[PDB]
Design a protein around this ligand. Sequence first.
Ligand SMILES: NC(=O)c1ccc[n+]([C@@H]2O[C@H](COP(=O)([O-])OP(=O)(O)OC[C@H]3O[C@@H](n4cnc5c(N)ncnc54)[C@H](OP(=O)(O)O)[C@@H]3O)[C@@H](O)[C@H]2O)c1
Ligand SMILES: NC(=O)c1ccc[n+]([C@@H]2O[C@H](COP(=O)([O-])OP(=O)(O)OC[C@H]3O[C@@H](n4cnc5c(N)ncnc54)[C@H](OP(=O)(O)O)[C@@H]3O)[C@@H](O)[C@H]2O)c1
Ligand SMILES: CCc1nc(N)nc(N)c1OCCCOc1cccc(-c2c(N)nc(N)nc2CC)c1
Ligand SMILES: CCc1nc(N)nc(N)c1OCCCOc1cccc(-c2c(N)nc(N)nc2CC)c1
Ligand SMILES: O=c1ccn([C@H]2C[C@H](O)[C@@H](COP(=O)(O)O)O2)c(=O)[nH]1
Ligand SMILES: O=c1ccn([C@H]2C[C@H](O)[C@@H](COP(=O)(O)O)O2)c(=O)[nH]1
Lengths: 529, 521
Amino acid sequence: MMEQVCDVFDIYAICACCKVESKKNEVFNNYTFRGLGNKGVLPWKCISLDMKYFRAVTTYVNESKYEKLKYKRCKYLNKETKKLQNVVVMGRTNWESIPKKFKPLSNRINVILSRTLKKEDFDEDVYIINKVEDLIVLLGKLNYYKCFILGGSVVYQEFLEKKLIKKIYFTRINSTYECDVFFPEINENEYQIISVSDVYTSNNTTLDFIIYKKTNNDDEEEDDFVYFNFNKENDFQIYNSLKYKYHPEYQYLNIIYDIMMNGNKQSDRTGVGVLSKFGYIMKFDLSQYFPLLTTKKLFLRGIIEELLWFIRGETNGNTLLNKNVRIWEANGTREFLDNRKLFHREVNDLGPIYGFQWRHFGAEYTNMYDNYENKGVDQLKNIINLIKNDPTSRRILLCAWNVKDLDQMALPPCHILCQFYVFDGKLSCIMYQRSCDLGLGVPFNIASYSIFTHMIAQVCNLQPAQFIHVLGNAHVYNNHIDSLKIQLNRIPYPFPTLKLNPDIKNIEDFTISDFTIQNYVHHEKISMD
Amino acid sequence: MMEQVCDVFDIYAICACCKVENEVFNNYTFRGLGNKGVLPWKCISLDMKYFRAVTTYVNESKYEKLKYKRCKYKKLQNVVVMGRTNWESIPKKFKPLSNRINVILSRTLKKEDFDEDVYIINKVEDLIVLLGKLNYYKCFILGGSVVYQEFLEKKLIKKIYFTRINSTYECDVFFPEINENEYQIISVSDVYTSNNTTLDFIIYKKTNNDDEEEDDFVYFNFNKENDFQIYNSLKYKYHPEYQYLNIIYDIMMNGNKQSDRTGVGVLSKFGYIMKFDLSQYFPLLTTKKLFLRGIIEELLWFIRGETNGNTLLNKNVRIWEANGTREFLDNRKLFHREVNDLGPIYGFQWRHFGAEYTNMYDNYENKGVDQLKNIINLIKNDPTSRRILLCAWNVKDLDQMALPPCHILCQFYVFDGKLSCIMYQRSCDLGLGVPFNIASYSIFTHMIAQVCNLQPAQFIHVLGNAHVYNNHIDSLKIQLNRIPYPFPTLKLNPDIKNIEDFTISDFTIQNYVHHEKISMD
Ligand SMILES: NC(=O)c1ccc[n+]([C@@H]2O[C@H](COP(=O)([O-])OP(=O)(O)OC[C@H]3O[C@@H](n4cnc5c(N)ncnc54)[C@H](OP(=O)(O)O)[C@@H]3O)[C@@H](O)[C@H]2O)c1
Ligand SMILES: NC(=O)c1ccc[n+]([C@@H]2O[C@H](COP(=O)([O-])OP(=O)(O)OC[C@H]3O[C@@H](n4cnc5c(N)ncnc54)[C@H](OP(=O)(O)O)[C@@H]3O)[C@@H](O)[C@H]2O)c1
Ligand SMILES: CCc1nc(N)nc(N)c1OCCCOc1cccc(-c2c(N)nc(N)nc2CC)c1
Ligand SMILES: CCc1nc(N)nc(N)c1OCCCOc1cccc(-c2c(N)nc(N)nc2CC)c1
Ligand SMILES: O=c1ccn([C@H]2C[C@H](O)[C@@H](COP(=O)(O)O)O2)c(=O)[nH]1
Ligand SMILES: O=c1ccn([C@H]2C[C@H](O)[C@@H](COP(=O)(O)O)O2)c(=O)[nH]1
């Protein structure tokens, strides 16, 4: 049949939404991001990246695309056939919140909705309209590329109600501010997310940009591509329905996907069996976000305590258990130690694992209570020294794989080494991981080495840049498959941030209350079994 | 002015050429077309699969524009043009070629044979008239040396789809020398192994002598910020050597300027990965000449557990020379170390990790951890282990080494009779060291695979601090504008069944085609 008005006239909404104030265990969904305005203005001071994106989207035209849009509009209306511009439509209140120096919005055809004001009341080159229908009539008369509904709660509400919106360009501002007006609850039957962007920081908040779409209910050289592909040989509907998956959480999600679809079926030490592949790299920009997975719920207390226990050079499992952190519990039982032929090892004496190697590489391990002060190589101090005093060194490495002591460890380390890189007052870190449990271990391990990059950067007067995560044997356990099918069909939220107490200037001086995660928005806890 | 015949009728050549019976190499090296009135080689499956696929493909919803142009000047198919000898060359199982408009070009052939679809022609220009009379997608020449010779003299060819067969055969007929001024290469494919040869697919191009979500792409890039003319002029650079060259290109464009320990200065970035498929090729760079005797001897000297630099020096392998001098060792504060006693470096750590180092002459038999044997046992007896690692980075021993290792560790992976290897490298001199390093650990992966009765799969090379020295910049500009040749292969003596038994003569590099040596200095 004859198609609808949003399509012919290319009418979109663009908005920015923050999180809203209503005061441990809270539930997040798309509706979490809904705050539009407060007391006639925006809830926040300035978010310049959203303003830059807004400007980019609302001013962009493709001239060679116009001809086809022209024909289409003419055809729909039964008709023969300055620089091209977009139309922008604002509510009256919206129009009045904008400072005069910015009105009318440059390089766009401005249009205000109003009953109480008429063309006489405006000095500016703008079109006044008093009915939504009158917008449509105008779009028939104007030459323009696209039409963006710039907002106002009232304006948004009515355009979505009359189904005049083809795509919503929606910015998720990942912070909380006092709000009095709200974006309307979007119906999932009517609109689905098709694109999610990278995550960014601007003005002390993370944000991303997503695109909702209205639901389904040269010439020679492109042939050369098909030639070069001559030798190419249901569970992820949502995951596969996304056009642009640029959120960095997709680095992790794409690897699971790849292991699930193309991984090798293998037995393993545990007896569970896995799907495995060999050799991946992920990169997280810590200047922009803290990459805590949002597709399921993670907590950070344990892994921080673990890291503090590493830095103190400890190998005593009782220390963790006494803080109700059980990450190493299974690896310290009588039964487990005896299976490792460690019959003369005390329960929870984990042997010369991470802490011991970081502080005392090469010392003879005795028992977990011994005093090892000044024995072996204090690699941790050495790397901090090298970062401060020879930042361009290519030898800044922290290594836990001590070949000589492997058999005395409760189990050999998975996280083999850290290599550090300094440029322009910024610290980056590569961690190489020999064995990577994708469903359970990896999300924690990303968090751990991201925290440790921040710690090391701070005590060295640098800013953290990239955590780069190298996976050797990357594997999905079979008892994890169904849980990860659920996970890969969840859409990430903008990442949270990590704040460290800025007064901590030595690696040893950190305690648990020196760390806070801010603005963690996540899907529900999944049990992997 | 008035646009050209081949630009209208879409006339393409498609060949496969081999090499023919201290040499310099060029594109002309691959020119071997035919012999005895047949193909030089027994059968090259993959190229045949490529051949079919290229010449049978049509995009129907793109004929409309091609119809438009050819007039202005059921079952849509392609014109395949062949000469008489070539038509006679094919057995009649396949004749006339499946799904295509077979057209034979013979100034003698008795026209009135099977004349439903076989279209004989006697003159040269008669084809372009017969193309006008037809509903065809693209026109392919596959003729023979002379059929090729003429269509090229006549400038009728738009693109050459050229398969480079990387082996040497007896030939009597040859593809004409393509003129560098008149055709340039625009695309280069992955490298493959088919029927005991490597090959790749290149494309010469004639030198001029719902877009809703397309906008969303532009929206997502709102926040983005002639030295490489030939490099940049390629559309499709799929040859695996581009993993190496792209990394150089990247460091060059976006690297960070840094001082280093040496005083030369570098452009550096942090963290890359390259992957080479050893089942298909030996990844010995072809954009400059590389030698391998030295690096093999080094690997043999590693496997023996040696730390004596004199052993290499006496074989005229000077890789470790500069690190064994009196001045170098003293700069390391190794005032009590004999010249060329490199300390507990790779060999020592692979066979004796954790033993006490005394001097290069001592006997360390059964001292320390023999990692090399452990990883061989693990690979043979526990191949799904996730612990198969060989680590040279011994923290206790670093200061005793002439220098700390660049190649931190290898990790091994086994599935389906196949061995892969990751080597992590903390420090990567892109211009000089990395090319040897790829080769060295590739060979080592072959070595370990063989003695464990496995087949090599991937070598995977992870780069920490990756840097281009400033003194290499100009040499690398020249290198990045050279187009790779299909890779050689490595043959190991199959009799060798233990890691300790290889010697220098057990290794053969075959069909190494390369550009001219570059001196990086
Ligand atoms: N964060 C974002 O993405 C975003 C975007 C835009 C605006 N804002 C914020 O949102 C708030 C404004 O929202 P709001 O809902 O209160 O006001 P609004 O939607 O901007 O304006 C509503 C007014 O526009 C006129 N109007 C609306 N629909 C009409 C129709 N069909 N026909 C005729 N006139 C019509 C009426 O004007 P009269 O009163 O003149 O009759 C009405 O009172 C402010 O806080 C602003 O800062 C936020
Ligand atoms: N690897 C590859 O790319 C490839 C592909 C195909 C074939 N080949 C090989 O190449 C060899 C054949 O090469 P070739 O050049 O000697 O033979 P060819 O080009 O296949 O055939 C030559 C014949 O075509 C006819 N012909 C040539 N020019 C003509 C013109 N201007 N007008 C009309 N007819 C013309 C002549 O037949 P009459 O004068 O007798 O009528 C001539 O004897 C074979 O060994 C074959 O295996 C290689
Ligand atoms: C918040 C920006 C935004 N972002 C997304 N993604 N969608 C929207 N509809 C949107 O608002 C559109 C309403 C516009 O509001 C104001 C309110 C006060 C000031 C300014 C403002 C500013 N300070 N400097 C510049 N140069 N120009 C403007 C006008 C665009 C804008
Ligand atoms: C080397 C093949 C080749 N490759 C590139 N790239 N271009 C060429 N023009 C070309 O020659 C193509 C000319 C004709 O060749 C022959 C010669 C003998 C046998 C067969 C042959 C075969 N044996 N089995 C199958 N099933 N089907 C065919 C015919 C397609 C092909
Ligand atoms: O921080 C950790 C610790 C362990 N593992 C996983 C990887 C393996 O599934 C298992 C260790 O088994 P081996 O690879 O050591 O066999 O634990 C992680 O992913 N991260
Ligand atoms: O096999 C090797 C050995 C050395 N290097 C280079 C990397 C550095 O440029 C230099 C070692 O210097 P440090 O990074 O150790 O300072 O040698 C390689 O690329 N490959």
